[PDB]
């Protein structure tokens, strides 16, 4: 089997993608952030507490003829970024651009916190790390990739993130037409339950590369590139203006600025990020002080190829036995 499915911005900065995604039967449709960089589908539901619902599309599991409780199974995740959420949990019927896996852990959400309400445009995250990630206590559960992997023609998935525009996802199959060139794969360390691989380094604009070991993660659930502190400064270096504000919270530039380019290694191939790509606007509405795409990693305790990167390329996340990630230009 395969699925395909698009995947959209949720504004005009690229802030995240959604994908819909059916639940239950009949199918409630849902659109979910996917996340390389956790493991847990969970969703906004008839259950999320009131107060903390505000424009979200929500799973009634009670509608599903396919619901069932799991009994006794919680969840609690905490984000990178200091959001949360927590509930209890039903296997389902889930289907993503017509890859269908049943008995699927939907996490049904009674809490989220503030950040989560305030975005009308996600009703969940559907994760895509490693299973081990999971935070279903006390059954551990799989996410919808390794549920669906045996079943899939290849055990594959794809993440082509557009810039300012749709993309797709793609599991079981490799889309030869969706990219230039030829994809470069590369080795994964799975120890801490990412996708983690080790750039061969960076240039910046039309500099020289640098060669130079960088692990990361690639995150689709990660807006920025968050890289070394050297590497961010001999970033920013290159933009007239652009400052280090403790204040905003990283790196500004400004807004008449015209950004370098960021180039990363993968293997002996290069990916290239346009500089438009790391442009996230105005710091605060009307402000001439924008908000750089390329931020220190330091105190994060991990390098995160997060959506800036990912998007400027065609990335296989390969679940084959010895898992390893590709990367085409496209």
Known sequence: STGSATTTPIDSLDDAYITPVQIGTPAQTLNLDFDTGSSDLWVFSSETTASEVDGQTIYTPSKSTTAKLLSGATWSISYGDGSSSSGDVYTDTVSVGGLTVT??????????????????????????????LNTVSPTQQKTFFDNAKASLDSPVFTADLGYHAPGTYNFGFIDTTAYTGSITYTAVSTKQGFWEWTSTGY????????????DGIADTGTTLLYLPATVVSAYWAQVSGAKSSSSVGGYVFPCSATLPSFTFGVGSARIVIPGDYIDFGPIS?????????????AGIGINIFGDVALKAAFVVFNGATTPTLGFASK
């Open 103 to 132: 008995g699927q852990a939907v996490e049904s959400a009674k809490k989220v916190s503030s950040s989560f309400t305030e975005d009308s445009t996600i009703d969940g995250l559907l994760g895509l790390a490693f299973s081990t």
């Open 285 to 297: 509405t009307g402000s001439s002080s924008c908000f750089g795409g390329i931020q220190s990693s």
């Open 203 to 214: 240039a910046v604009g039309s500099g020289t590369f640098k060669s130079t070991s960088i």
